[PDB]
A paper describes a structure:
We identified multiple mAbs from antibody phage display library made from COVID-19 patients and further characterized the R3P1-E4 clone, which effectively suppressed SARS-CoV-2 infection and rescued the lethal phenotype in mice infected with SARS-CoV-2. All mAbs authorized or in development are directed to the RBD, which interacts with the target receptor angiotensin converting enzyme 2 (ACE2). Our crystal structural analysis on the R3P1-E4 scFv and RBD protein complex showed that both the heavy and light chain of R3P1-E4 directly interacted with the RBM of SARS-CoV-2 S protein through the residues extensively overlapped with the binding sites for hACE2, suggesting R3P1-E4 neutralizes SARS-CoV-2 infection through competition with hACE2 binding to RBM of the SARS-CoV-2 S protein.
Purified R3P1-E4 scFv protein and the RBD protein were mixed in 1.5:1 molar ratio and their complex was used to generate crystals. The crystal structure of this complex was solved at 2.9 Å with a final Rwork value of 24.8% (Rfree = 27.4%). Both the heavy and light chains of R3P1-E4 bound to the RBD protein through the residues extensively overlapped with the binding sites for hACE2. The topology of the R3P1-E4 antibody in its interaction with the RBD protein was similar as REGN10933, CB6 and B38 antibodies but different from other antibodies such as H014, CR3022 and REGN10987. Multiple heavy chain regions including G26-Y33 of HCDR1, I51-T57 of HCDR2 and A96-V107 of HCDR2 and light chain regions including Q166-Y171 of LCDR1 and Q228-R235 of LCDR3 are involved in binding to K417-N487, T415-Y473, R403-Q493, Q493-Y505 and K417-Y505 in the RBD protein, respectively. These interaction regions covered all the RBM of SARS-CoV-2 S protein, which is critical for binding to hACE2 during viral entry. Thus, our structural studies suggested that the R3P1-E4 antibody may neutralize SARS-CoV-2 infection through blocking RBM-mediated binding to hACE2. Furthermore, we found close contact interactions of K417 of RBD with multiple residues of R3P1-E4 antibody including the Y33, Y52, S100 and E101 of heavy chain and N231 of light chain. These interactions may explain why B.1.351 and P.1 variants, which respectively carry K417N and K417T mutations, were selectively more resistant to R3P1-E4 antibody as compared to WT, B.1.1.7 and B.1.617 strains. More importantly, by introducing E101Q mutation in the heavy chain, we found the engineered R3P1-E4 antibody had improved binding and neutralization activity to both B.1.351 and P.1 variants.
Residue numbers in the entry:
A (entry chain B): 335 to 389, 395 to 515
B (entry chain A): 2 to 117, 141 to 244
Write the structure that this text describes.
């Protein structure tokens, strides 16, 4: 009785720089709950058919609206390149639902972060939770914040008033 | 026997988006497949049918922009959506149309798309206590004989057939659900509201293109 619903219904999700992989093993669960809660703004399956499921990794993170399109084979952008990369030959399913009511708050929610500065693109399924001052300039930073010496992370600032593409979405990626 | 449908997301107006809908127990090219959307705040709205023989139809507000199709090789119905606008924001279901012989009995789960003869129903909203008896009515402008169905849709979940052919109960439905009428006036009775029965109920004509009524909501 696999805990798919512990991933989905977690009362808290994480950041895309620090996404949570939960390995499911020693179990058998239907993927019924995916295709039975009609309340998902996106559900795509690559390399497999979503009917042929029932006859191993759950990754959960929060991003904003018009970049869930990046959590897919072959897409690129600030997320696919520096936060959560998903390979071009993915065999799994991407599940995403608006979380405005839960990850937004008045005056802005700056608890969810993403990686703005990274010198090279991530490998597929790679993770980088490094907080080293990114050198933008020609002068060494010596780990000190300032000009050309930037904390490579950036807050989302999820506010309920945001346009629909700038609203917080919860994403679950089941890789097979 | 499911319909799992896939793809959706956001898109700025003008863009295009291709919904899919894979079936398991049914053969897509052998049935009447159809798309229904529920706009936020509105009720159910038929989008487009595809006949088993290949004919295609659409509602006025989507004709020329949308293209229903199917791939017999992987048994999947598609909805091709171009020239999208804000009014195309709705939850998009795919459903098997048995028509006058069974309604839309097999529905997919929703896929929220976010763009940045009149049927009548009365009451529009009603509160009833658990174990009450509830009768909602549906009215037709032209006489449609007994060709009319009923569906419950609970908030968030896909619709569900109850009665088709005015009086025939869909297999797997509690006996408390019952319905009668012919001509232009139709009723749905719940003999004893059990807490699960709290939702909104539509009628639909089963002759024409699927045409749903406004909807009557039950609540406490």
């Amino acid at each position: 009785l696999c805990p798919f619903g512990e991933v989905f219904n977690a009362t808290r999700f994480a950041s895309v720089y620090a996404w949570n992989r939960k390995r499911i093993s020693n179990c058998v669960a239907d993927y019924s709950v995916l295709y039975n809660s009609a309340s998902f703004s996106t559900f795509k399956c690559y390399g497999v058919s979503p009917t042929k499921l029932n006859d191993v990794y759950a990754d959960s993170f929060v991003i904003r609206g018009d970049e869930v399109r990046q959590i897919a084979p072959g897409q690129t952008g600030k997320i696919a390149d520096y936060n959560y990369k998903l390979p071009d030959d993915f065999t799994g399913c991407v599940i995403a639902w608006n979380s405005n009511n839960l990850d937004s708050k008045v005056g802005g929610n700056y608890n969810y972060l993403y990686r703005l500065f990274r010198k090279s693109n991530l490998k597929p399924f790679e993770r980088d939770i490094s907080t080293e001052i990114y050198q933008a300039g020609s002068t060494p930073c010596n780990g000190v914040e300032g000009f050309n010496c930037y904390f490579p992370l950036q807050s989302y600032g999820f506010q309920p008033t945001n346009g629909v593409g700038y609203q917080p979405y919860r994403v679950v990626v089941l890789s097979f | 026997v499911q319909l799992v449908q896939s793809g959706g997301g956001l898109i700025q107006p003008g863009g295009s988006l291709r919904l899919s809908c894979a079936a398991s127990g049914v053969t897509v090219s052998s049935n009447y497949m159809s798309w229904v959307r529920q706009a936020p705040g509105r009720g159910l709205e038929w989008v487009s049918l595809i006949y088993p023989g290949g004919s295609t139809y659409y509602a006025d507000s989507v004709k020329g922009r949308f293209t229903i199709s199917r791939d017999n090789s992987r048994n999947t119905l598609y909805l091709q959506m171009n020239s999208l606008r804000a009014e195309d924001t709705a939850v998009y279901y795919c459903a098997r149309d048995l028509s006058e012989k069974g309604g839309m009995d097999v529905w997919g789960q929703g896929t929220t798309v976010t763009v940045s003869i009149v049927m009548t129903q009365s009451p529009s909203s009603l509160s009833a206590s658990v174990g009450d008896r509830v009768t909602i009515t549906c009215r037709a402008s032209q006489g449609i004989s007994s060709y009319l169905a009923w569906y419950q849709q609970k908030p968030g979940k896909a619709p569900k057939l109850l009665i088709y052919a005015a009086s025939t109960l869909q297999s797997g439905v509690p006996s408390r659900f019952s319905g009668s009428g012919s001509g232009t006036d139709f009723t749905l009775t719940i003999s004893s509201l059990q807490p699960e029965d709290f939702a909104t109920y539509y009628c639909q004509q089963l002759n024409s293109y699927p045409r749903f009524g406004p909807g009557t909501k039950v609540e406490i």
